[PDB]
A paper describes a structure:
The Developmentally Regulated GTP-binding proteins (DRGs) belong to the OBG family of GTPases (which also contains the Obg/CgtA, YyaF/YchF, Nog1 and Ygr210 sub-branches). In addition to the GTPase domain, these proteins also contain a C-terminal TGS domain of unknown function. The yeast Drg1 homolog is named Ribosome-binding GTPase 1 ([name]) as it was found associated to ribosome. It associates with yeast Dfrp1, namely [name], which is also a ribosome-associated protein.
The final model of the Rbg1fl–Tma46205–345 complex (R-factor 19.7%, Rfree 22.2%) includes two molecules of the complex in the asymmetric unit although the complex behaves as a heterodimer by size-exclusion chromatography. The [name] structure shows a domain organization that includes the well-conserved G-domain (G1 + G2 + G3 = 64–169; G4 + G5 = 245–293), an N-terminal helix–turn–helix (HTH) domain (1–44) which lies adjacent to another domain formed by a 65-residue long insertion (176–240) between G3 and G4 of the G-domain and the TGS domain at the C-terminus (294–369). We named this new domain of [name] the S5D2L domain as database searches indicate that its topology is related to the ‘Ribosomal protein S5 domain 2-like’ (S5D2L) superfamily despite the absence of significant sequence similarity. The two amphipathic helices, α1 and α2 (2–44), comprises a previously unnoticed HTH domain at the N-terminal of [name]. [name] fragment present in the structure shows a non-globular type of fold predominantly formed by α helices interconnected by coils. [name] helices envelops [name] forming an extended and extensive interface (buried surface area in the interface ∼2978 Å2) contacting the G-domain (helices α1, α2 and ß strand) and the TGS domain (helices α3 and α4) with no contacts with the S5D2L and HTH domains. Our complex structure demonstrates that the region of [name] contacting [name] is larger than these earlier estimates and encompasses residues 216–279 and 302–338. Interestingly, the interface between [name] α2 and [name] α8/α9 consists mainly of aromatic ring containing residues, which form a π-stacking interaction. Superimposing human OLA1 structure bound to ATP onto the G-domain of the two chains indicated that the P-loop in chain A adopted a closed conformation where entry of GTP could be difficult whereas chain B had an open conformation.
Residue numbers in the entry:
A (entry chain C): 214 to 282, 302 to 338
B (entry chain A): 2 to 45, 53 to 125, 131 to 369
Write the structure that this text describes.
């Protein structure tokens, strides 16, 4: 399938959706979606892997290489993260964004 | 107002005027007349930080017709059930909530006020000053709603998923309008360019086209000081009425994230894409002796991430006693490098400030 031409939502509604043979469609059940999602995420990872090889390393990534192989700001930083985190009670934290959950409170 | 009446009169004329070689000049002028009027409506300390308190490093706006899908969406993204005010359609803006994603506080606003057919200008200003918009659609009936949402947003000078056009306009003294061209122009004639420039009462100028510019593109450039270019994500809810092949097909539409707010499908993707489009910059602080913490980045905005901005984000005084900064990362061309206040940082740079 590879690089395929892009479409508009208009094109999708008006012509593209109808090119599909309806009796061949795969139902979007919980099981079928999970299988599709599994492959979706795997492709992202493969796409990203290729981009990583070409992207300049981050400051974080650089230190990590250096690791694996004067101004005292403490007072100001401590205060900053305290301030930054003081209202945390009313704020949902997604952490690093992996495996989020979506429970509703109140 | 006469000024709001003047806009309708032009929209009306355009709709009943057929578009040909003979009418194109006039229609060009009409578009320009229309643009000028619409900017006058914005003319007045507005939007985020003024009309509502700014409560994150980024603020993100939701635009959609009232529905169970959209209420569940917001409730789910923010973790708190919709409040009394989030159900009123007379209400213009609400804050469904603030989230934290990869260390950044992101304010989430709902903007029902953009759809309504003093305070009306406040919702517009807020919309214009968001960092990213989510346009919420029901994939079973997307077109009507999409068309209205876009018209309303374009109408108030928001340009979704666009970079400013590559047109240079140098204003001249004598010799009228002169035009340069790179890629051949498939959409503008000289007549139409003159139509726009004269309507803008620009006697003489030199205009250089480095893009296959449309008449709107030219106007945008003329109106550059008030246009707000912003990422927008088309959130296509209700995929459970589709199928796998149909779902796959939606990914051929740029800036679309298909979801199901009931099932939670692709909410994770929605947030990932949001993060990607916001282009925030996490800086990791490192003291001379010890290592960087990586737990608590200072998060800076895309257009406000100078070493100067980093300093100020930490404490007002730092600039006064700043010698320089040691930086590892993609923002410097050698690892590490000493830099000055004006040095522009990049996501996940590691920084050690030094005392004068």
């Amino acid at each position: 399938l590879e690089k395929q031409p892009k479409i508009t939502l208009e094109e999708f509604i008006e012509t593209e959706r109808g090119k599909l043979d309806k009796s061949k469609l795969t139902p979007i059940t919980i099981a079928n979606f999970a299988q599709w999602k599994k492959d979706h995420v795997i492709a992202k990872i493969n796409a990203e892997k290729k981009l990583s090889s070409k992207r300049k390393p981050t400051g974080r990534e650089i230190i990590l290489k250096m690791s694996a192989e004067a101004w005292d700001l403490t007072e100001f930083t401590d205060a900053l993260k305290k301030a930054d985190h003081q209202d945390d009670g009313g704020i949902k934290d997604y952490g690093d964004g992996s495996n989020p959950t979506f429970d509703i409170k109140k | 107002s006469t000024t709001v009446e003047k806009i309708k009169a032009i929209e009306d004329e355009m709709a009943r005027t057929q578009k040909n070689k003979a009418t194109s000049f006039h229609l060009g002028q009409l578009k320009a007349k229309l643009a000028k009027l619409r900017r006058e409506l914005l003319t007045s300390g507005a939007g985020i930080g003024f009309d509502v308190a700014r409560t994150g490093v980024a603020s993100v706006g939701f635009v959609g017709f009232p529905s169970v899908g959209k209420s569940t969406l917001l409730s789910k993204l923010t973790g708190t059930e919709s409040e009394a005010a989030e159900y009123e359609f007379t209400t213009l803006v609400t804050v469904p909530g603030v989230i934290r994603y990869k260390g950044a506080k992101i304010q989430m606003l709902d903007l029902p006020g953009i759809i309504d057919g003093g305070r009306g200008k406040q919702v517009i200003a807020v919309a214009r000053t968001c960092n990213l918009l989510f346009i919420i659609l029901d994939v079973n009936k997307p077109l009507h709603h999409k068309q209205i949402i876009e018209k309303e947003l374009e109408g108030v000078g928001i340009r979704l998923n666009k970079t400013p056009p590559d047109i240079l306009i140098k204003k001249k003294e004598k010799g009228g309008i002169s035009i340069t061209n790179t890629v051949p122009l498939t959409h503008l004639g000289n007549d139409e360019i003159r139509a726009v420039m004269s309507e803008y009462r620009i006697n003489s100028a030199e205009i250089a086209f480095r893009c296959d510019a449309t008449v709107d593109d030219l106007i945008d450039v003329l109106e550059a000081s008030s246009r707000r270019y912003m990422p927008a994500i088309y959130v296509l809810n209700k995929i459970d009425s589709l199928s796998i092949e149909e779902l796959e097909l939606l990914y051929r539409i740029p800036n679309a994230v298909p979801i199901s707010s009931g099932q939670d499908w692709n909410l994770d993707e929605l947030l990932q894409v949001m993060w990607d489009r916001l282009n925030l910059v996490r800086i990791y602080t490192k003291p001379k002796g010890q290592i960087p913490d990586f737990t608590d980045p200072v998060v800076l905005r895309s257009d406000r991430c100078s070493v100067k901005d980093f300093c100020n984000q930490i404490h007002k005084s730092l600039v006064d006693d700043f010698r320089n900064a040691l930086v590892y990362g993609s923002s410097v061309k050698h690892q590490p490098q000493y830099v000055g206040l004006s040095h522009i940082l990049e996501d996940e740079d590691v920084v050690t400030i030094l005392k004068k």
